[PDB]
Amino acid sequence: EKKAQEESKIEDVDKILNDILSISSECIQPDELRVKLLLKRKLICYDGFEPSGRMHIAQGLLKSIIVNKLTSNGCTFIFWIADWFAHLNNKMSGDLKKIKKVGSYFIEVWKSCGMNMENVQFLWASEEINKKPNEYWSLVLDISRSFNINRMKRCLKIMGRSEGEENYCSQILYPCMQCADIFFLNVDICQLGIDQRKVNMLAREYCDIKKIKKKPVILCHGMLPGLLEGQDENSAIFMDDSESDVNRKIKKAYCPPNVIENNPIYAYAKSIIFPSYNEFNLVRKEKNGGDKTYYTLQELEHDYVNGFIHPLDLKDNVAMYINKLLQPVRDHFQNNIEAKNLLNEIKKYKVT
Amino acid sequence: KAQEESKIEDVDKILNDILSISSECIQPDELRVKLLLKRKLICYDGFEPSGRMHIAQGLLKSIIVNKLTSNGCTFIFWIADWFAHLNNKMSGDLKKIKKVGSYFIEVWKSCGMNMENVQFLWASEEINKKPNEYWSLVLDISRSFNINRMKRCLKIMGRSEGEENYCSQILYPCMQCADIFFLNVDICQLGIDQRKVNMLAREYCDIKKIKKKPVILCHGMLPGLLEDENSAIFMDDSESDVNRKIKKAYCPPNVIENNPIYAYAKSIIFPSYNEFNLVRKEKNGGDKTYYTLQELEHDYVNGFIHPLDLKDNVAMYINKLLQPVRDHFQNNIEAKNLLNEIKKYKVT
Ligand SMILES: Nc1ncnc2c1c(OC(F)F)nn2[C@@H]1O[C@H](COS(=O)(=O)NC(=O)[C@@H](N)Cc2ccc(O)cc2)[C@@H](O)[C@H]1O
């Protein structure tokens, strides 16, 4: 009993570790993630969002699957409404009133994205920062003392900017603040897209500079590609798209036969549809011979390169399953009259 | 009647007194407009608690502040504690920075600034009272200027572009620029080494279409004593320290430019006594009382005043002006322990 209780505990951490890594395109030190799973408390994870218009399905549907996997494995998750960051980054022409409306719309979508809200929080940056402004801004100032300008300009990607354009001082303040959020929120796991990893590597550098041994674990998820080959409004599906809009965008999306690399249609099947249902039921023509079910990811790869999966069949299955997962969101913005007028209000905004 | 004619008399008199502080006031005509809107203008200067107080920040500041406050203005001493930490002063130790700040207040209250129209404000304390307004302003300023434009303000921190440029060197001038608006400052009265960030604040007004623009009233920099601790006189120097540093100081004959000894006589001693009594042996020219700066300058450039004679009187005058400060830190026990504490601090 005394020995058997140790063996089950070790295998318990091993399986929790392995399926947390399954949703990560890359993890900065899986050995550190195992150490954090051995602590008798829940791990704090977070992702941050600039309210700058309609919601990408990666931020609604893809996020719901990741947060569900983390909260079922001893983690709590924070949605960070980066309102002040969107203002600093000139989103919505910097209009703070519009940013807050888009933030409220994001929370309305997330609340009906099929997530489990028992261990999930929605926190607003400006609210939390002004609750403890001495601690927060002292962190920001101490981070600015630690890195030079060129080191910080390597984080431009986290705000969708580049060195080719005019670099405003806000592009130095922004990554200092995002880096400070990681410690301000006492985050254990930084669960953001790979486009944010530069500033998360910075936070780990800051721990070694300041001799902080509680370094955050970076658990970056891959970026869902654009629908067109080599990746405006038709580049991805959004949470408010209708059943007709999804079918139209998927129909003209890039889906090369017998090839899965850079295939956004297949990428939707692997990252969105499959983890939602834990299977993929490929329905086909009325008599040609379809309605087949898959169960793991490895057999999905082997059969698309095999030719048993036609492009029109994969696209129509992807488009159909995307519409099923989006229907709880459409139903909420149809029956709940207050959210319906909220959606109509933010759709009249001009995307900057 | 003739009561309107005496109104321009009062305004033009205050104009002349205030404009005498700076050699290049940014638009004197705007200053006259501010005085007609209200007499109680708000002036400020800001200080990093980074060690012992330079006499420019004590004896020279007192000359400037009392000129402004006697004309109905308010003067804010901005004890820039967070800026000193951001600039790596006192090894960034905030507890020692606060200690130096308290010592700065004790010097100022004993060298002519214990008065109702002077306020001692701490940066961290005031920012934390209205943090949403302050930091929103810092962020909006950062959105309005690019990196190269902000790196021009490096001089306000005592840095240069040839050294390693940290991100704190971008945040610092954003926060100093915000202070001008946060404090509702009418007149920025700082040394000319701070002028570039004040010009930035006026650019920010034109970008934001803000009509209330600050007037920049920058005073000249006292040159350094050398051509460390000996490159300047400090408010806590003893008589022997002042005499030693003056004697070994730079004082080129016939040349007043970059002359710290002549600068102390012209900017500190002459305004304090409305004269300069040059004590000399008869064979060296004999005692002479200077009533104007024009004759003082003419005599020095023509060789009538040898540098040794100027040094001896300047050192004697500096020691007489530091006497209220010394008596305060010698007699007041709590001020004595404060100075003794900050003396053993290492500078960085
Ligand atoms: N196609 C895709 N596939 C997979 N993941 C994707 C996307 C995508 O597409 C996009 F164009 F909409 N975004 N994301 C991910 O969603 C989240 C928000 O996105 S964001 O608004 O851009 N956030 C920022 O810019 C961050 N500086 C905001 C921020 C601020 C302070 C913090 O303390 C933490 C974060 C981040 O995690 C992103 O990685």
Ligand SMILES: Nc1ncnc2c1c(OC(F)F)nn2[C@@H]1O[C@H](COS(=O)(=O)NC(=O)[C@@H](N)Cc2ccc(O)cc2)[C@@H](O)[C@H]1O
């Ligand atoms: N030799 C001299 N002759 C004539 N004036 C002199 C000096 C001298 O010598 C020196 F080395 F000690 N300082 N000053 C003047 O004293 C004051 C404070 O000086 S400081 O501590 O350096 N503060 C800074 O630099 C400022 N960025 C701090 C600051 C921060 C936020 C604000 O909202 C405003 C200001 C400023 O007005 C300076 O011009």
Ligand SMILES: [Cl-]
């Ligand atoms: Cl506030």
Ligand SMILES: [Mg+2]
């Ligand atoms: Mg007072």
Ligand SMILES: [Mg+2]
């Ligand atoms: Mg004599």
